[PDB]
């Protein structure tokens, strides 16, 4: 029973690619077949597009509550 917007804000997408790229650079397992690119940013992007990034966004509301949204649950903009 979540009320925030079901779309991924440009900031959420940015910080997700930033953090997930850094995790890939630290060789956390990648969720999707590398065709052979090696720039962690390109892999993180490929994950996102395949909706396999293992991150949930904890969106704080002004009152103090929060709603966890799987990256696979909400809609990507670009």
């Amino acid at each position: 029973k979540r009320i925030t917007t079901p779309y991924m804000t440009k900031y959420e997408r940015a910080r997700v690619l930033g953090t997930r790229a850094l995790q890939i650079a630290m060789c956390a397992p990648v969720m999707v077949e590398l065709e052979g690119e090696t720039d962690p940013l390109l892999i993180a992007m490929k994950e996102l597009k395949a909706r396999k990034i293992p991150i949930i966004i904890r969106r704080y509301l002004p009152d103090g509550s929060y709603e966890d949204w799987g990256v696979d649950e909400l809609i990507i903009s670009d």
């Binding site: 490929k46 597009k49 990507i76 670009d78």
Partner: protein, 75 residues
């Protein structure tokens, strides 16, 4: 497949014939298809309404090909 060149090259199909390839808009195009003579169709992950014009473009291109080059074939 016939027309497959004995060396394993499929070009006798794709270079003489108007090919199609269905992919998501976002997915980086397949390197074989991009080298091959094949028409890319871009589909949205969430905007179902944009599907109809894409398939219309398919029937449009197919009809162009059938009428110009294979109109003698029977429909």
């Amino acid at each position: 497949w016939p027309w497959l060149l004995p060396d394993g090259s499929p070009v006798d199909i794709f270079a003489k014939i108007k090919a199609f390839h269905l992919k998501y808009d976002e997915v980086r195009l397949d390197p074989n298809v991009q080298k091959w003579d094949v028409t890319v169709l871009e589909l949205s992950y969430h905007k179902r309404h944009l599907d109809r014009p894409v398939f219309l473009r398919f029937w449009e291109t197919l009809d162009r090909y059938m009428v110009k080059h294979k109109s003698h074939l029977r429909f």
